[PDB]
Design a protein around this ligand. Structure first.
Ligand SMILES: [Ca+2]
Ligand SMILES: [Ca+2]
Ligand SMILES: [Ca+2]
Length: 321
């Protein structure tokens, strides 16, 4: 998509069985607990086009998902079936979608709405993980404000009632730092700039006490061979290994299969709760084979992942399973 992403756009949010316009001042910020529809009008190479992006939040319920399907169908027909359709889940946005927000990063908030509870309120202390990919697309995902949630490869934003902090991992990029600043502009707070390893007491205090966090040599590395996740399965009747593209998300770990995470200087073998013994055995063979055709193979179990593994995921959640 050569289009520059500067066309007119309307973003509605799925609320109940309706779509509801989103504050146009906030376009670019989404609730991870919600589903969205983006009608994008553009003109490129002389022709006018239309894209509907159906954005599904990571914590979006099955009924919200069902509601956006009807809602899209309606919108499609209303526009006389002219536009291009694209279904997108959180963390797998194509470049073109990321560009719609004027170079600004996509901000994904904890929480959202539902039929029962309505709009959740934001917490008083909140932490954001700001990660950008190879191409400079940047995502600031809200996570739990604990010391353990940090990782050296990204920049973090911490916002308490009384203070703000911009924590920069040894491995964070300029894109990630710029992104952090934009989030802070949206949060309307002034940062205290903090480098990893020389944090003030107030910073650890705001996160509920200093603790170990997601770090490794590779996580710390500034230069960047970005890590690669593979799904290993034998559900189809024979063992197979396929790569998972886009941002590394907790949902990407198949709870009934084994996963390989190649961080170059280490291969992680993630074992699903509901995986079968054969799946792991084979995976250990395959990993050993990947390596031998050009390194520690660390074996990790669902729910018992070490900080060195989790750090590679954009926004982990201890109570996900
Ligand atoms: Ca929701
Ligand atoms: Ca990073
Ligand atoms: Ca399986």
């Amino acid at each position: 998509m050569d289009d520059d992403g500067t066309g007119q756009k309307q973003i509605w949010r799925i609320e109940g069985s309706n779509k509801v316009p989103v504050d146009p001042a906030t376009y670019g910020q989404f609730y991870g607990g919600d589903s969205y529809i983006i009608l994008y009008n553009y003109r490129h190479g002389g022709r006018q086009g239309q894209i509907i992006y159906n954005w599904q939040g990571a914590q979006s319920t099955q009924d919200e998902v069902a509601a956006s399907a009807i809602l899209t169908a309606q919108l499609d027909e209303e526009l006389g079936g002219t536009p291009v359709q694209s279904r997108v889940v959180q963390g797998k946005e194509p470049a073109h979608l990321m560009s719609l927000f004027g170079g600004k990063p996509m901000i994904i908030y904890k929480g959202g709405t539902s039929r029962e509870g309505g709009q959740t309120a934001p917490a008083s202390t909140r932490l954001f993980q700001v990660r950008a990919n190879s191409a400079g697309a940047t995502r600031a995902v809200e996570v739990l404000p604990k010391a353990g949630a940090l990782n050296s490869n990204d920049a973090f934003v911490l916002k308490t009632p009384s203070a703000a902090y911009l924590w920069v991992g040894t491995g964070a990029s300029e894109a990630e730092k710029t992104g952090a600043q934009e989030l802070l502009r949206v949060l309307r707070a002034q940062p205290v700039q903090v480098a990893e390893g020389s944090e003030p007491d107030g910073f650890w205090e705001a996160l509920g006490g200093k603790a170990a966090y997601r770090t490794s040599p590779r996580l710390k590395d500034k230069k960047m061979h970005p890590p690669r996740l593979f799904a290993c399965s034998n559900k189809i009747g024979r063992f197979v290994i396929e790569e998972v593209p886009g941002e590394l998300m907790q949902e990407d770990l198949a709870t009934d299969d084994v996963m390989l995470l190649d961080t170059w200087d280490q291969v992680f073998v993630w074992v699903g709760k509901d995986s079968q013994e054969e799946e792991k055995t084979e995976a250990l063979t395959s990993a050993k084979r990947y390596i031998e055709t050009d390194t520690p193979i660390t074996v990790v179990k669902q729910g018992f992942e070490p900080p060195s593994f989790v750090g590679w995921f954009l926004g982990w959640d201890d109570d996900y399973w």
